[PDB]
């Protein structure tokens, strides 16, 4: 029974499910994560209380991005254009 023999992370999985928050990026992910699996929460005790996954916001840096890494030095370079 095929499309089962072979599963494999979906595309960009580290972070899909994570949900856009500025509150507190890797809980608020490490819980769309928890329920995504369907995992309730007073099944996994102690385990689902301090825990992140990778956030779709949080960025390659510590830094809590609120849009993409391009379209953020997108941002610094464009405020900075002396009249040509």
């Known amino acids: 029974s095929p499309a089962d023999t072979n599963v494999v992370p979906?595309?960009?999985?580290?972070?899909?499910n994570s949900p856009p928050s500025?509150?507190?990026?890797?809980?608020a992910a490490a819980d769309a994560?928890?329920?995504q699996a369907g995992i309730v929460s007073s099944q996994s005790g102690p385990n689902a209380?301090?825990?992140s996954a990778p956030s779709s916001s949080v960025n390659?840096?510590?830094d809590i991005i609120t849009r993409p890494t391009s379209d953020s030095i997108a941002?610094?370079?464009?405020?900075t254009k002396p009249a040509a």
């Open 60 to 62: 390659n840096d510590g």
């Open 75 to 79: 941002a610094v370079a464009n405020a």
């Open 49 to 51: 209380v301090g825990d």
């Open 10 to 16: 979906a595309k960009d999985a580290p972070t899909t």
């Open 22 to 27: 500025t509150t507190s990026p890797n809980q």
């Open 33 to 35: 994560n928890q329920q």
